[PDB]
């Protein structure tokens, strides 16, 4: 599913993402925008290391979910990577909460550093009623 901006904003708020581990909703929106364009079925194979990124937040198979074909992988979210390709994002959110419980926090995603950190991210949630 390809979410519309405000639809996703309200969904994330209902799932308890606003302020989770100090991360504002606008930051989560900026992340999803740059990771997948709000697309839950987005996948990207990384030929260099044989891993694949899955879903709206692009979780890498070497660390977060199990796809069975990634060498030396762990499954920290204890989920099949298939669950991160659903239209319902409940599992993807539970995994995002798991990712930020680590010390790096939101910085775990390189894209956040490049496109969201130190920027005015208000535009991502403006007018959504959140």
Which approach determined this entry?
Answer: X-ray
- Which DSSP category does 38 fall into? S
Domain span at residue 19?
1-130
* Domain at 49, CATH number: 1.10.530.10
Catalytic residue among 4, 7, 18, 35: 35
Contact 84, 92 (CB under 8 A): yes
Q: Where are the alpha helices (DSSP H) in 20-126?
A: 25-36, 90-99, 110-115
Residue 4 a catalytic site member: no
User: How many domains, the chain?
Assistant: 1
PDB resolution in Å = 1.8
What does the block give as tokens for 54? 């899955």
In sequence order, the 6+-apart residues with CB closer than 8 A to the CB of 42 are 35, 36, 53, 54, 55, 56, 58
Catalytic residue among 7, 18, 49, 53: 53
Q: Calculate the CA 45 to chain-centre distance.
A: 16
Residue 7 a catalytic site member: no
Whole-number Cα distances in Å, 90 to 8, 14, 41: 12, 10, 14
């Amino acid at each position: 599913k390809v979410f519309e901006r405000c639809e996703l904003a309200r969904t994330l708020k209902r799932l308890g993402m606003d302020g989770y581990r100090g991360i504002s909703l606008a930051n989560w929106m900026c992340l999803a925008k740059w990771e997948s364009g709000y697309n839950t079925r987005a996948t990207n194979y990384n030929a260099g290391d044989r891993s694949t990124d899955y879903g709206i937040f692009q979780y890498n198979s070497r660390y977060w979910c199990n796809d069975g074909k990634t060498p030396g992988a762990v499954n920290a979210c204890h989920l099949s990577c298939s669950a991160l390709l659903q239209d319902n994002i409940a599992d993807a959110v539970a995994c995002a909460k798991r990712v930020v419980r680590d010390p790096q926090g939101i910085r775990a995603w390189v894209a956040w550093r490049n496109r969201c950190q130190n920027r005015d991210v208000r535009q991502y949630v403006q007018g959504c009623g959140v």
